[PDB]
Design a protein around this ligand. Structure first.
Ligand SMILES: NC(=O)c1cccc(N)c1
Ligand SMILES: NC(=O)c1cccc(N)c1
Ligand code: NA
Ligand code: NA
Lengths: 191, 192
């Protein structure tokens, strides 16, 4: 398999859980981490690293890459581990910032049941991902691609879409090598 | 920054692309005129594609893993395909009958149909030529959002691509955006 459980013991586990809890906000008191698995996908990772170096070479602005969260359903977990994030596996209910795959800066958003619904055991799946957001532009409802840059720009479209230029909290990506799942956090609601 | 480079007619590359096009145009051979052929260049996508190709060649015992195929499209999707490759998101929607992916034709007679490459205001029709990593394929069906399941007797869960029929496949559906590399764009027209 492509998932490897990490020991609570480790620096990796602790930094991943630290960042998760540090952005749970309101939800922090009622969410418990069950386990954290490292995700491995050698091909996708190498494809991502190529996309990353190209963006670093092209983009004058920094950062080009962000750590973001993605809540999903139990059934989608194996597909995302095998094939990365794309529309066909990920939730296709959100259209307000475009018809792509949605990622959150803060876990408080991804831990909501509408995005990471519990399975039979009450377990919820939240991926942590390295995402090449690059140059993002304001998302538009129903758009199938990232928004157009317009005339002050040699490129046709932004690299990603976002909810708002003021404290962006949601990013929409439209290419399947633009986000590399690094970890899967299984968590649960606890009073 | 330019993705597209017009080829001169009196070059080996132009002539080779056009011969392959006419060779599978079938009954349309008589009625389709090539206006322009352009080379598509997308260095990042090509490298990502070459990595996928290498992995598939290592994993697969059968051959060929890669095929030259055709993709008809609408005028407005052309700049997105050159800049971003083939997607449901950057392409124009494709068909749905063998799954919700990107559709490629073995024969240019299929892609040249107006339903897939509708003429623009000037009567010009756009057909990409692509290298496509079809790998192991299985029968596609409606509503599939990945290649079909391989079923019992296979180590892998799914095929690499879907096709119309396992005997003499003529259509392939791919579901990953690094699985197809546009190499050329043929602009053609109906002649009366
Ligand atoms: N699936 C998710 O974690 C998510 C992230 C941001 C926005 C939405 N709608 C969903
Ligand atoms: N867009 C295309 O050229 C094409 C080829 C085969 C089948 C379909 N549906 C489309
Ligand atoms: Na522009
Ligand atoms: Na199987």
């Amino acid at each position: 398999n492509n998932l490897e459980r990490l020991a609570e013991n480790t620096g990796e586990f602790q930094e991943v859980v630290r960042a998760f809890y540090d952005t749970l906000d309101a939800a922090r008191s009622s969410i418990r981490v069950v386990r954290v698995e490292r995700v491995s996908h050698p091909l996708l990772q190498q494809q991502y690293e190529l996309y990353r170096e190209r963006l670093l070479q092209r983009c004058e602005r920094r950062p080009v890459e962000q750590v973001l969260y993605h809540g999903t359903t139990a059934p989608a977990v194996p597909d995302i581990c095998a094939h990365g994030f794309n529309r066909s596996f990920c939730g296709r209910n959100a259209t307000v910032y475009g018809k792509g795959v949605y990622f959150a800066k803060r876990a408080s958003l991804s831990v909501q049941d509408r995005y990471s619904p519990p399975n039979a055991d009450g377990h919820k799946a939240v991926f942590v991902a390295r995402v090449l957001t690059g140059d993002y532009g304001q998302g538009r409802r129903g758009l199938r691609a990232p928004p157009l840059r317009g005339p002050g720009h040699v490129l046709l479209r932004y690299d990603s879409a976002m909810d708002c230029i003021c404290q962006p909290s949601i990013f929409v990506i439209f290419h399947d090598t633009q986000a590399l799942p690094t970890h899967l956090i299984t968590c649960e609601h606890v009073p």
